[PDB]
Specification:
Chain C: This is Cell division cycle protein CDT1. Chain C: Belongs to the Cdt1 family. This is part of a larger assembly, with chains A, B and C. Chain A is an alpha/beta fold. In chain A, the strands form six sheets. Chain A has a five-stranded mixed barrel with strand order 4-8-9-11-10. A five-stranded parallel sheet of chain A has the order 13-16-19-12-20. A three-stranded antiparallel sheet of chain A has the order 6-5-7, with no helix packed on it. Helix content of chain A is about 35%, strand content about 15%. Chain B contains eleven helices and ten strands. In chain B, about 35% of the residues lie in helices and about 15% in strands. Chain B has helices at about 55-65, 70-80, 85-95, 130-135, 190-205, 230-235, 245-255, 265-280, 280-285, 295-310, 320-335; strands at about 15-20, 35-40, 45-55, 115-120, 155-160, 165-170, 180-185, 205-210, 215-220, 220-230. Chain B has a single domain (about 55-335), classed as 3-Layer(aba) Sandwich (Rossmann fold). In chain B, helix 1 crosses helix 7 and helix 10 (about 295-310) crosses helix 11 (about 320-335). Chain B has a three-stranded mixed sheet with strand order 1-3-2, with no helix packed on it. A three-stranded parallel sheet of chain B has the order 4-10-7, covered by helices on one side. Chain C has helices spanning about 20-25, 90-110, 185-190, 230-240, 250-255, 275-280, 290-300, 310-320, 345-365; strands spanning about 30-35, 60-65, 70-75, 130-135, 150, 180-185, 210-215. Chain C has a seven-stranded antiparallel sheet with strand order 1-6-5-7-4-3-2, with helices on one face. Chain C is elongated. Classes of the chains: A alpha/beta, B alpha/beta, C alpha+beta.
C-alpha cells in the first residue's frame, strides 16, 4: 500500500524531533544493528503508530528498518557496504502477558511475556526454502518451508506423473540462522494445582546473550513466538506497602514474629524454622577484585524420626518463597542437578539446559535415597554456585547458586544418640561440610507435650499475634532485592576471640573440629538476621544469635559425651 | 597460534590449510611449525601450503650470562616476582625442564632421563601462575587441565566428524608434547579412562592406544608439572617431588648438544646419603607408622644432579650440584613424612 | 563511558583550549578534571564533623535527623546573607575550587551572548554553596543550582527517565578515581541555545558532596523569558523546595503554596493511559470490559512510580465527562472510551491539550 509512504515520512520527521540521534550514533559507532525505541515515546507522539504496531507488526516492521537505514545512511556515509539491514528493538510494552493467556486472539501481534529459558540452541539450521530431486527422471522442483511444519511432501513430478522416491536438495537453498529456546513459566507465579506451560521461541539477528535458568522478559510477535527484544533483568511491592514494611521492621523485634509466622499448622520448635528462615532470607555475595566468590546461600539439612514433619514444613516454605521449586525425588531423579547437555530428537542435535531456580531455593526430600549423578551434581553446586557443561561442542558455565533445603532419614529409623552423625547417616564429611546448619529432632514423652502438640495439630485440622502470610512473603521479596548490609571493623574482632576458644575446646573433648567455614556461616547468619532486621549494617548482638544457631547444630550433631560442651557454651549463651 | 601469547578474554583461533603431495606426512601434529603459502578464499579463508620448515649477540650475551657465579640465584630471583618464599619449590620447578642424562646403552635397555614434579597446597600461591611462565618459557609445552578442558583434551579424545557421523580422534596435550614437558592443573579431577594412560606414561613415557583399526604406541617424552589440592600411592610414588628468548635458545641448545655423566667422587656422597637415610628412617618405619625410600628416588636424585650440572653447559658433575640436590630432596621427604 | 580527558599543565596560559571546550559540550556535558595540586588538601576532609549548635533559618547547616548537615553556605557582602563557619581546610579547597570555577567560567561562558554578566561572582561575591555532609531511600534528583558547578566526588552520575543525555531512560553509573566532575546549571541551558542537560545524585562513597556553585546575582538581567523572575528568588524557591522544611514561616509557606503543582506526575498518566486502553481496543473484540487487576501492573510497568486508585480518583475529580465510574455485578470499578472510532490522533492531541488546560485552570483556582 501507499499508506506506508505517509507513515514513513511521519516517523522520519519524528526521530529528528524527539534522544534518537544519540541512539543512532551509539548503534552506528558500535557497528551495531540494534536500535532502541521505547513504546511510550512514539505512543505519546502518535497513538495510531502504536495501534498499527499492536495490530500488524510484521508490516509495521517493513517501515522501521528502512527509515533506520536511511537515517544511518544520511548520518554516516557508506554504511550499506558493511551492514545491509538494521533492526529495531521495541521495548517498554505496557501489557505484560502470561504464558497461560496466550490465546487465538493474540495471533499476529506484539506480546511481552515472562519466563525461564531452557534447552537453548545457537545458530542451529532452520528451513525457509527447499528443492527436491525426482529420482525417476532425475529432476529438480522447489517451494517454500517455514518454521512450524515438518516438511511439505512433494510426490507429484512435472512429467513423470510418478509417486517415486524424492530426495531433499538443500545444496541450492536458503540461508537460515536459527536459535530457538524452549521458554517455560516461572514457578514463583503459577497458581496452585495447575501446571506451568511452555513455548518455543525463535531468536534471529541476539544469540548467546541469554542465561539459561534465569528469569527473562521477551517482547516479540505471536504466530511459535518470534522474539524481537530480550531482557535478562527480569506479585510485587508497591509504594503504599513499602513504608509500612519499614514501620513494621522498626518495632517490637520482628525476628521472633517471623519465626512464629513460619509454622501455622503445628507448634514445632524454633530450631527447624530458624534455619529455614535464615536460609530463605539469605546473605550477600561478595567478591574481591573480581575473584574469590563466596556463596551467599545457606543450605540447611534436616534429620530425625520419620513420624516428625519434615515434608510439610518444606512444602510450606516453598509455597511462601519466590522461585522455590520442590523437586524432591528418589528413583525418579533422572538428570542430577537440573544441568544437562543432551541430544534432542526433534531435529537431531546437541543442546544444553539447566532444567528448572538460579536465585531461588531448591527443596530436596529423602536425601539419602539417590544415585551417583544427582549426588555429584548437587555436590558440584554446593562446592560452587555454578554447573559447567563441557560437551557436544558447547562449553557453558551456568548459574547454580540456589539455596539447598534438604531433608533426610537415618539408617534404621532411630537416631541412635550414642553414636555421631557421621556413623548415623550414610553420607561422609565433605558433603556434610557444605551444609552449614544440621538440624536434628528426636523423640518426646510427658503430659506437657501431649497437652500442647496434639491440641495444636487438631486446632489446625478443626479449622477447615504473628505476622500475616501475605505481608511476610512480600517482605521477603522487598528485603532480598533492595538491601546489602555490610560489616564494619570497629568491634567485630571479638568474634575471632570467641572462635579461638570454641575451636580449641572441640579438640580436647570432642572428636570433630570447627573450621573457617563455620566462621563464614555465622557471618552469613548474622548478616541474614540483619537483612531480616532491615538495618544498614550488622549489629553487635546478631552474632550472639548466630553463635547460638551454630552451637545448637554442631553440639547437637554429636554424641551424649560432648555433654560438658553443653555447659562450656553456657558462658556465652 | 602460540597459546603462551594469546589474550585471556578469548580462546585461540585457528586456520585451515591444504597440503599437497611432496610434503605429505612431513609434519607431526603438535610442534612449532613455520608455514609459508597463499592466503586464499573459499566468506572463508584458507592456506595453500607451498613451503614448510620447523643473531650472534644472543649467544654472546648468553655466554656472558653463563659466566656469572650467582646465575642460579638470580634465575630464582627472577622466576618469582611476587611469590613470597618457596625457594625449594622454585628450584625444583626450574630443574624439571630437561630432565636428566639420556644415555643410550649398547644393550638396548636405556634409562629414562625425564622426571616428575607435583605442586600441592591451598588455592593461590601461583599454583596456576607459574604454570603460565613454564608454558611460555619451555620449548614444547601446552597448557591443559584435569579431565581435559573446554573443547580440548589432555587425553586422546574421540568424537564424530559431523559430515556423516564418523568416528575420529582429537589429539590432546599428550601426543602434541613429543620431546618436552606437559603441564596440567586440577589433578584430583581425572577420568578413569585417562588415568590409566597417564599412569603408564608417567613412568614409561609410552602411551599405548588400541581401538577399531588403529593400534599404536605413541612416544611421549613428557615430564609432568601438575598441581593438586588409591590416590595416595599415585601421589606418593609416581612423583619425584611433592632475556626469555635467549634462555629458551640456551635450553634448546643444551637439550640437543650435551649428554653429561657423573664422577665417582661426587657419587660417594650420594651413597653415604642413601645409607644414612635408610639407617635413619627405619626407626620410624619399624614403629608401625606406615608413612618412601627406593632406588627410584636415588635415580631421580641422579637425574636432578644431571640437570643441575647440565644448566652450566658442562658434561661433568661435582659436589657443588649434589649439595643443592640433597637440599632439594630433603624438603620433598619432609613433605612426604608429614 | 566516553568522558573527555585533558591535561592541566598546558592550559595555564589560557590560549589553546577555548574552542575545543566550546565544541565538546555540544554532545558531552559532564566534564572530568584531573592532575591538580590538591593531593594533600583533598584528604583533609575530617575537620568539620561534629558542630551541631545553630538552627537553620535558610543559612548554614540544616541539621536534619546525626546523618545530614546540609550547609547552605550564604555569601558575605550581599544583603539578607551572612554566614561564617570555622571551615579552614574547606576555605582552602573553596579558594582553589573557586579559582578553578572562575578559570572554567572565563574559558567557557565567553562563547555565549554575555561574557561579563554570568561571571558576576568576581565583583559582588555571590556564592551560596551546598556542603551536603552525610556524616555518621535517599533524597530527590539534584541538578546544580548555580550556572556552573565543579565538585570533588566518587562516582556522581545517574540518569532519570527523560529526553536528555544518555537517553536510554535507565540509571547509568561509571566510577572515577582521584578527579573532579563539572556539571552546569539550568540557567546556562537557557542562556546557551540548548546544549546542556541534568544529572541526578545520591549517596556516594565520598558522601560529602561539596557542591560549589557560581550562583548568579540578585539583580542579574536575564532575557525575555526570565525578565520578571530573577535567578535568586527562583533558585531559592528550588533550594527551599527540595528537602524537608520545618524551621521557619516563609519556606514552609513556599512549600504549601508550591508543592501542589505536582500534576505532572498524574497528567503524564493521561499521556499514556488512553494508549494502553486503545491497545486493548485493537486486540480484544470483547467490547473492552477491563479489570483493575490487569490494568494496574500495566501502567505500573509503564511508569516506575507508584500507581494506585488515588490517581484514578484524581483523574475522575479533574475530568469526569470522558470516563465512567460504573460498577459491575461482581463489585469492581469499570471504565471505557466514549469514542465511536478506535482512536484518532488529532482528537487525542486535542483531548490531551484540554486535560492540560483543565489541570492548569485547577492549579490557578486552587491558589
Amino acid at each position: 500500500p501507499n499508506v506506508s509512504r505517509t507513515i514513513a515520512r511521519e516517523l522520519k520527521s519524528f526521530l529528528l524531533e524527539y534522544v534518537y540521534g544519540a541512539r543512532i550514533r551509539t548503534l552506528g559507532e558500535m557497528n551495531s544493528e540494534s536500535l532502541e525505541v521505547n513504546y511510550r515515546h512514539l505512543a505519546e507522539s502518535k497513538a495510531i503508530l502504536a495501534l498499527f504496531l499492536a495490530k500488524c507488526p510484521e508490516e509495521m516492521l517493513k517501515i522501521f528498518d528502512l527509515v533506520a537505514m536511511e537515517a544511518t545512511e544520511l548520518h554516516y556515509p557508506d554504511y550499506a557496504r558493511i551492514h545491509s539491514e538494521i533492526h529495531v528493538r521495541i521495548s517498554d510494552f505496557p501489557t505484560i502477558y502470561s504464558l497461560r493467556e496466550l490465546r487465538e486472539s493474540n495471533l499476529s501481534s506484539l506480546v511481552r511475556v515472562t519466563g525461564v529459558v531452557t534447552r537453548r540452541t545457537g545458530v542451529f539450521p532452520q528451513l525457509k526454502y527447499v528443492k527436491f530431486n525426482c529420482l525417476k527422471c532425475g529432476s529438480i522442483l522447489g517451494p517454500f518451508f517455514q518454521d512450524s511444519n515438518e516438511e511439505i511432501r512433494i510426490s507429484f513430478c512435472t512429467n513423470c506423473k510418478s509417486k517415486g522416491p524424492f530426495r531433499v536438495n538443500g545444496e541450492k537453498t536458503v540461508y537460515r540462522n536459527y536459535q530457538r529456546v524452549t521458554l517455560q513459566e516461572a514457578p514463583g507465579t503459577v497458581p496452585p494445582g495447575r501446571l506451568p506451560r511452555h513455548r518455543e521461541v525463535i531468536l534471529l539477528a541476539l544469540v548467546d546473550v541469554s542465561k539459561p535458568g534465569e528469569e527473562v522478559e521477551v517482547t516479540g510477535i505471536y504466530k511459535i513466538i518470534e522474539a524481537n527484544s530480550i531482557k535478562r533483568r527480569e506479585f510485587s511491592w508497591t509504594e503504599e506497602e513499602e513504608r509500612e514494611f519499614r514501620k513494621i521492621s522498626r518495632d517490637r523485634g520482628i525476628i521472633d514474629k517471623i519465626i512464629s509466622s513460619m509454622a501455622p499448622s503445628i507448634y514445632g520448635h524454633r530450631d527447624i524454622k530458624t534455619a529455614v528462615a535464615c536460609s530463605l532470607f539469605g546473605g550477600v555475595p561478595k567478591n574481591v577484585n573480581g575473584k574469590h566468590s563466596i556463596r551467599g546461600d545457606i543450605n540447611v539439612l534436616l534429620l530425625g524420626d520419620p513420624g516428625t514433619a519434615k515434608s510439610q514444613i518444606l512444602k510450606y516454605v516453598e509455597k511462601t518463597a519466590h522461585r522455590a521449586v520442590f523437586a524432591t525425588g528418589q528413583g525418579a531423579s533422572a538428570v542430577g542437578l537440573t544441568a544437562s547437555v543432551r541430544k534432542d530428537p526433534i531435529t537431531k542435535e546437541w543442546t544444553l539446559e539447566g532444567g528448572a531456580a538460579d536465585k531461588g531455593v531448591c527443596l530436596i526430600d529423602e536425601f539419602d535415597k539417590m544415585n551417583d549423578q544427582d549426588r555429584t551434581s548437587i555436590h558440584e553446586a554446593m562446592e560452587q554456585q555454578s554447573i559447567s557443561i563441557s560437551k557436544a561442542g558447547i562449553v557453558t558455565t551456568l548459574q547454580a547458586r540456589c539455596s539447598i533445603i534438604a531433608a533426610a532419614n537415618p539408617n534404621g529409623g532411630r537416631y541412635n544418640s550414642t553414636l555421631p552423625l557421621a556413623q548415623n547417616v550414610s553420607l561422609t564429611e565433605p558433603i556434610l561440610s557444605r551444609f552449614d546448619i544440621l538440624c536434628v529432632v528426636r523423640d518426646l514423652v510427658d503430659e506437657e507435650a501431649d497437652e500442647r502438640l496434639a491440641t495444636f495439630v487438631v486446632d489446625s485440622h478443626v479449622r477447615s499475634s504473628p505476622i500475616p502470610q501475605e505481608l511476610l512473603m512480600k517482605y521477603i521479596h522487598y528485603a532480598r532485592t533492595k538491601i546489602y548490609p555490610k560489616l564494619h571493623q570497629m568491634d567485630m574482632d571479638k568474634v575471632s576471640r570467641v572462635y579461638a576458644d570454641l575451636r580449641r575446646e572441640s579438640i580436647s573433648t570432642g572428636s570433630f573440629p570447627i573450621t573457617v567455614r563455620h566462621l563464614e556461616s555465622i557471618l552469613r547468619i548474622a548478616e541474614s538476621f540483619a537483612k531480616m532486621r532491615l538495618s544498614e549494617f550488622v549489629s553487635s548482638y546478631d552474632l550472639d544469635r548466630a553463635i547460638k544457631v551454630v552451637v545448637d547444630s554442631f553440639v547437637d550433631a554429636q554424641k551424649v559425651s560432648v555433654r560438658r560442651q553443653l555447659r562450656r557454651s553456657f558462658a556465652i549463651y | 597460534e602460540i597459546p603462551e601469547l594469546v589474550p585471556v578474554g578469548e580462546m585461540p583461533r585457528n586456520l585451515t590449510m591444504t597440503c599437497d603431495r611432496y610434503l605429505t606426512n612431513k609434519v607431526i601434529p603438535g610442534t612449532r611449525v613455520t608455514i609459508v603459502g597463499i592466503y586464499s578464499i573459499y566468506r572463508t579463508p584458507y592456506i595453500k601450503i607451498l613451503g614448510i620448515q620447523s643473531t650472534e649477540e644472543e649467544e654472546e650475551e648468553f655466554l656472558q650470562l653463563s659466566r656469572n657465579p650467582k646465575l642460579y640465584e638470580i634465575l630464582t630471583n627472577s622466576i618469582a616476582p611476587s611469590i613470597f618464599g618457596n625457594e625449594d619449590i622454585k628450584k625444583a620447578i626450574v630443574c624439571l625442564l630437561m630432565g636428566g642424562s639420556k644415555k643410550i646403552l649398547p644393550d638396548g635397555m636405556r634409562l629414562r632421563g625425564d622426571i616428575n614434579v607435583l605442586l600441592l597446597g591451598d588455592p593461590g600461591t601461583a599454583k596456576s601462575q607459574l604454570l603460565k611462565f613454564v608454558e611460555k618459557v619451555s620449548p614444547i609445552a601446552v597448557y591443559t587441565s584435569g579431565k581435559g578442558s573446554s573443547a580440548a583434551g589432555l587425553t586422546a579424545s574421540v568424537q564424530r566428524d559431523p559430515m556423516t557421523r564418523e568416528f575420529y580422534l582429537e589429539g590432546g596435550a599428550m601426543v602434541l608434547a613429543d620431546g618436552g614437558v606437559v603441564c596440567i592443573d586440577e589433578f584430583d579431577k581425572m577420568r578413569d579412562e585417562d588415568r590409566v594412560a597417564i599412569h603408564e606414561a608417567m613412568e614409561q613415557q609410552t602411551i599405548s592406544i588400541a581401538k577399531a583399526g588403529i593400534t599404536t604406541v605413541l612416544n611421549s617424552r613428557t615430564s609432568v608439572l601438575a598441581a593438586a589440592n588409591d590416590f595416595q600411592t599415585t601421589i606418593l610414588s609416581r612423583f619425584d617431588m611433592i632475556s626469555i628468548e635467549k634462555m629458551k635458545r640456551y635450553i634448546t641448545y643444551c637439550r640437543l648438544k650435551c649428554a653429561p655423566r657423573l664422577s665417582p667422587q661426587a657419587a660417594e656422597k650420594l651413597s653415604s646419603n642413601f645409607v644414612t637415610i635408610r639407617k635413619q628412617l627405619l626407626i620410624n618405619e619399624l614403629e608401625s607408622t606406615e608413612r618412601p625410600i627406593t632406588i627410584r628416588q636415588l635415580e631421580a636424585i641422579i637425574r636432578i644432579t644431571e640437570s643441575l650440572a647440565k644448566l652450566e653447559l658442562s658434561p661433568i658433575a661435582q659436589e657443588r650440584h649434589v649439595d643443592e640436590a640433597i637440599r632439594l630432596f630433603q624438603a620433598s621427604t619432609m613433605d612426604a613424612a608429614s | 563511558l566516553r568522558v573527555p580527558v585533558i591535561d592541566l599543565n598546558r592550559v595555564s596560559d589560557e590560549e589553546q583550549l577555548l574552542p575545543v571546550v566550546r565544541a565538546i559540550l555540544l554532545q558531552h556535558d559532564t566534564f572530568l578534571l584531573k592532575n591538580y595540586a590538591n593531593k594533600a588538601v583533598l584528604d583533609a576532609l575530617l575537620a568539620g564533623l561534629t558542630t551541631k549548635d545553630l538552627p537553620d533559618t535558610s543559612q548554614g547547616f540544616d541539621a536534619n535527623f546525626v546523618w545530614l548537615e546540609q550547609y547552605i553556605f550564604d555569601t558575605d557582602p550581599q544583603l539578607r546573607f551572612d554566614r561564617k563557619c570555622r571551615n579552614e581546610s574547606l576555605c582552602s579547597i573553596y579558594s582553589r575550587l573557586f579559582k578553578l570555577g572562575l578559570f572554567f567560567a572565563q574559558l567557557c561562558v565567553k562563547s555565549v551572548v554575555s561574557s561579563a554578566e554570568l561571571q558576576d561572582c568576581i565583583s559582588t561575591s555571590h556564592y551560596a554553596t551546598k556542603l551536603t555532609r552525610y556524616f555518621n531511600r535517599d533524597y530527590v534528583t539534584f541538578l546544580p543550582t548555580g550556572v556552573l558547578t565543579i565538585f570533588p566526588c566518587a562516582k556522581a552520575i545517574r540518569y532519570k527517565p527523560s529526553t536528555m543525555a544518555t537517553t536510554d531512560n535507565s540509571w547509568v553509573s561509571i566510577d572515577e578515581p582521584d578527579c573532579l566532575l563539572f556539571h552546569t546549571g539550568t540557567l546556562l541551558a537557557r542562556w546557551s541555545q540548548g546544549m546542556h542537560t541534568t544529572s541526578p545524585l545520591q549517596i556516594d562513597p565520598r558522601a560529602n558532596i561539596v557542591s560549589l556553585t557560581i550562583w548568579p546575582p540578585l539583580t542579574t538581567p536575564i532575557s525575555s523569558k526570565g525578565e520578571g523572575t530573577i535567578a535568586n528568588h527562583l533558585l531559592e524557591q528550588q533550594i527551599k523546595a527540595f528537602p524537608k522544611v520545618a524551621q521557619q514561616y516563609y519556606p514552609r509557606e513556599l512549600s504549601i503554596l508550591r508543592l501542589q503543582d505536582a500534576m505532572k506526575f498524574v497528567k503524564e498518566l493521561f499521556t499514556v493511559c488512553e494508549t494502553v486502553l486503545s491497545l486493548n481496543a485493537l486486540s480484544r473484540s470483547t467490547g473492552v470490559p477491563p479489570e483493575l487487576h490487569v490494568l494496574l501492573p500495566q501502567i505500573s510497568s509503564m511508569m516506575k512510580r507508584k500507581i494506585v486508585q488515588d490517581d484514578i480518583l484524581k483523574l475522575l475529580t479533574i475530568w469526569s465527562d470522558a470516563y465512567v465510574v460504573e460498577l459491575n455485578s461482581r463489585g469492581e470499578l469499570t471504565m471505557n472510551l466514549p469514542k465511536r472510532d478506535n482512536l484518532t490522533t488529532l482528537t487525542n492531541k486535542s483531548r490531551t491539550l484540554a486535560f492540560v488546560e483543565r489541570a492548569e485552570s485547577w492549579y490557578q483556582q486552587v491558589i
